[PDB]
C-alpha cells in the first residue's frame, strides 16, 4: 500500500489537491481509501510591534498546517508511476510511503 | 537523652529529636536509626539504655557539635587568610555566592543601615 501525506497552508488549496489525487488512482488503480483528515498544526507566534519600548503592544500570528492522509490499497503498475509523473500545485507537499 | 554532648528532647519522635544535634538532619537521622534498628515513630522516651548506647555510637561515626563548628570556622578562616574573592566576601560581610548586592542582601548585611 501507499500512504500519501499532503501538507499545506490553504485548506481550499489542499482540498483542490486532495480530490485531484484521488481521481488519478481511482481511474488507474482501484480502491482509493479516502481523504482522511489529520489534526491541523497551529504554530502561533507573538512579537512586539513597537520598535523601541511598548511591552504590552503585540501581534499574535499563527500558521495553520493542514494535513491530509490518503491511502491506496492495491497499487497497480499505473498507480505508482502515473501518479509519480503527476505533479500538484505548490503549497501542497506530497509524501508517498511505499509499503 | 544525652547524645554527643548535648541533651535531646524526650517528648518528640526519634528522627526529629535527633536533628537537634548540630550536624545531622532529616536525612542523616534516618541513616542513624536504620543502622541502629530503631523505628522512627518512637520517642526518645521508652527507649532502652542499650538502644541509646547503640544510638551514641552511630552518631559518633560522623562529624558533630564540637568537631563541625571547628571545621566550618577552619574553612572560613582558610579563605580569610588567602585573600581570595570568597575571603573578601566573608570579611566584608557581603554575600559570597554571587547574589545581588544592589538590593535584597539583608541576610548577610543584617537590617538596614540608614544614611545619617
Amino acid at each position: 500500500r501507499i500512504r500519501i501525506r499532503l501538507k499545506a497552508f490553504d485548506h481550499r488549496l489542499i482540498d483542490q489537491a486532495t480530490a485531484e489525487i484521488v481521481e488519478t488512482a481511482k481511474r488507474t488503480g482501484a480502491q482509493v481509501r479516502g481523504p482522511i483528515p489529520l489534526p491541523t498544526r497551529k504554530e502561533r507566534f507573538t512579537v512586539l510591534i513597537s520598535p523601541h519600548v511598548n511591552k504590552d503592544a503585540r501581534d499574535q500570528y499563527e500558521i495553520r498546517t493542514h494535513l491530509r492522509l490518503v491511502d491506496i490499497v492495491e497499487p497497480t503498475e499505473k498507480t505508482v508511476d502515473a501518479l509519480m509523473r503527476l505533479d500538484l500545485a505548490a503549497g501542497v507537499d506530497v509524501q508517498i510511503s511505499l509499503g | 537523652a544525652r547524645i554527643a554532648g548535648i541533651n535531646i528532647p524526650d517528648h518528640k519522635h526519634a528522627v526529629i529529636a535527633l536533628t537537634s544535634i548540630y550536624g545531622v538532619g532529616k536525612t542523616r537521622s534516618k541513616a542513624i536509626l536504620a543502622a541502629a534498628g530503631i523505628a522512627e515513630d518512637v520517642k526518645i522516651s521508652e527507649l532502652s539504655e542499650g538502644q541509646i548506647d547503640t544510638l551514641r555510637d552511630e552518631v559518633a561515626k560522623f562529624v558533630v557539635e564540637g568537631d563541625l563548628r571547628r571545621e566550618i570556622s577552619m574553612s572560613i578562616k582558610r579563605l580569610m587568610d588567602l585573600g581570595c574573592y570568597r575571603g573578601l566576601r566573608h570579611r566584608r560581610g557581603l554575600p559570597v555566592r554571587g547574589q545581588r548586592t544592589k538590593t535584597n542582601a539583608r541576610t548577610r548585611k543584617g537590617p538596614r543601615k540608614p544614611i545619617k
Binding site: 488549496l13 505548490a90 503549497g91 507537499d93 | -
Partner: protein, 208 residues
C-alpha cells in the same frame, strides 16, 4: 500607531499572499531569505518598469516568479531578451532552476503600488505635493475606483515643521473585512528628507 496594516489583516479573506509555497522549518528561513533577495534585485533592476507586485512560488525545488507590471514591453524588450537575462540571475540567487511569468496590469491608475510610486517620482523631481495628490485621486475615481485615499507625510516643500496631509474621495471602509482595499506604500528621498506616501484604493466588496 493606530491603524492595522490593511493588507495583512485581509490575507485570509480577500487578499492573497505574495508568496504561496510550503517548506518545513528546516528549509523555511532560507527560502524567506531567497524570496527577499529576488524581490530586492528585481525592484532595483525593474525600477523604470512600473512593477507592482512580485509573486513568488516554488514547486518541486524550482522557483516561479510572477511579475505584475503596467508595461511588459520594457520588461521583455525583444522576445526573450531581458526576461531571459533576468531569469538566469534569479537562478543564481535562488539556487534552483527559475521561471519568470509576467501578468499584465490593466488600469495602472487603480493599483496602489503604481500610484504611490507615481507620486514619489513626481515628488522626487520637485513638483508641488498638493498637485500630485489631486491628480492621483482624480485619475482613480475617473477610472472607476469606488474610493481612494492618498496620504503624504512629513517635510513637504522643504518646510521645517513636518506635517501630514491626506485626500479622500469616495468611501474607503477600512474596518470592513470583505472590502477590497488595495494598500501599498512608497517613500520619496528628497533633498530635504524622506517623504512617505500611503494610498488606499477601494474596488468593492467581495461577496464570497
Amino acid at each position: 500607531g493606530q491603524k492595522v496594516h490593511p493588507n495583512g489583516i485581509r490575507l485570509g479573506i480577500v487578499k492573497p499572499w505574495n508568496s504561496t509555497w510550503f517548506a518545513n522549518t528546516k528549509e523555511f528561513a532560507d527560502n524567506l531569505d531567497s524570496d527577499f533577495k529576488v524581490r530586492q534585485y528585481l525592484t532595483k533592476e525593474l525600477a523604470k518598469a512600473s512593477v507592482s507586485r512580485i509573486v513568488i512560488e516554488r514547486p518541486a525545488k524550482s522557483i516561479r516568479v510572477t511579475i505584475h507590471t503596467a508595461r511588459p514591453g520594457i520588461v521583455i524588450g525583444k522576445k526573450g531578451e531581458d526576461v531571459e537575462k533576468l531569469r538566469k540571475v534569479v537562478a543564481d540567487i535562488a539556487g534552483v532552476p527559475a521561471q519568470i511569468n509576467i501578468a499584465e496590469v490593466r488600469k495602472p491608475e487603480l493599483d496602489a503600488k503604481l500610484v504611490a510610486d507615481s507620486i514619489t517620482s513626481q515628488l522626487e523631481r520637485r513638483v508641488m505635493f498638493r498637485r500630485a495628490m489631486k491628480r492621483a485621486v482624480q485619475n482613480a475615481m475617473r477610472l472607476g475606483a469606488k474610493g481612494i485615499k492618498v496620504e503624504v507625510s512629513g517635510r513637504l516643500g522643504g518646510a521645517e515643521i513636518a506635517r501630514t496631509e491626506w485626500y479622500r474621495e469616495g468611501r474607503v471602509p477600512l474596518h470592513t473585512l470583505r472590502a477590497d482595499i488595495d494598500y501599498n506604500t512608497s517613500e520619496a528621498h528628497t533633498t530635504y528628507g524622506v517623504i512617505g506616501v500611503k494610498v488606499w484604493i477601494f474596488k468593492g466588496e467581495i461577496l464570497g
